[PDB]
């Protein structure tokens, strides 16, 4: 980059991507754990359901996903439960 | 024709064509093709210089040059005025304009532009023939 602000944005955007990817993967793993528990017919399904909803809302916070996406996922998880 | 006939096949007009086609086409060296550019004049190099016989009604030795233009098209152009300094490999500028007498001359070599020297001793209509005011 030929501009100082451009270089600064390169660094900060890279860091933000690291953080965002980490947190989004965390949310996906929460959803994945709940879905697999539903498939397997486990006993902790309700605890995992609360965790999945909690993860999705916390992901909506921090702006990892849009609010509409968050509500769609909540509805999808609710249907699964 | 009936209105229904015209609706089914509308009127179509004749398409005109230029009297000076070589001026209408440019050339793109990279792509090695001809472009469609209307140019008032065009630069060319005299590939040949000489004189030609008019058509039957007239008799003279009309002075002409075979010129390859900057767009690689080769044409024949007339040399107006009395006496000239042109030779083959001389760089000239061409304008539109037919010569009734000559069979295949569609362009005129502008005098006073590039290697074409003005007409010696010209004193009336000096703009044409490209001579300075004495």
């Amino acid at each position: 980059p030929n501009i100082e602000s451009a270089i600064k944005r390169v660094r900060t955007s890279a860091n933000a991507n690291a953080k965002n990817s980490s947190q989004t993967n965390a949310m996906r793993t929460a959803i994945k754990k709940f879905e697999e528990a539903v498939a397997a017919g486990a006993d902790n399904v309700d605890a995992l359901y609360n965790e999945a909803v909690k993860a999705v809302d916390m992901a909506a916070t921090k702006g990892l996903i849009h609010k509409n996406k968050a509500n769609r996922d909540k509805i999808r998880l609710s249907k699964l439960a | 024709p009936t209105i229904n006939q015209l609706v089914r096949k509308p009127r179509k007009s004749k398409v005109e064509k230029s009297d000076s086609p070589a001026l209408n086409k440019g050339y793109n060296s990279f792509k090695k093709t001809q472009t469609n550019v209307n140019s008032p004049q065009k630069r060319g190099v005299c590939t040949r210089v000489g004189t030609m016989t008019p058509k039957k009604p007239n008799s003279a030795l009309r002075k002409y040059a075979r010129v390859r233009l900057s767009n690689l098209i080769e044409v024949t152009a007339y040399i107006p005025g009395i006496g000239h300094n042109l030779q083959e490999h001389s760089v000239v500028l061409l304008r539109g304009g037919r010569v009734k007498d000559l069979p295949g001359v569609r362009y005129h070599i502008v005098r006073g532009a590039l290697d074409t020297a003005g007409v010696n001793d010209r004193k009336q209509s000096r703009s044409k023939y490209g001579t300075k005011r004495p």
Binding site: - | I3, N4, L6, V7, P10
Partner: protein, 80 residues
């Protein structure tokens, strides 16, 4: 409440389930000569239960895109 465009037309294809093809059959003045020429626009309308058959006069109201080509919803079948 704002209104969507509703058209009258004749069914010309019902070989697809949950859908019909309608034709509006308007006329337009030729720009140059002004004669009225027959002009056919056809729409793909979603049929709720494949009620309408071929060659039926029906009304269709514009809707949100229901498929790749669907943009209209059947309302009435006035002639069979």
């Amino acid at each position: 409440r704002n209104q969507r465009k509703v058209y009258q037309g004749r069914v010309v294809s019902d070989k697809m389930d949950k859908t019909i093809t309608v034709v509006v059959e308007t006329k337009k003045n030729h720009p140059i000569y002004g004669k009225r020429m027959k002009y056919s626009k056809k729409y793909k309308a979603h049929d709720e239960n494949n009620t309408a058959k071929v060659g039926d006069i029906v009304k269709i109201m514009e809707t949100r895109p229901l498929s790749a080509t669907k943009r209209f919803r059947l309302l009435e079948v006035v002639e069979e």
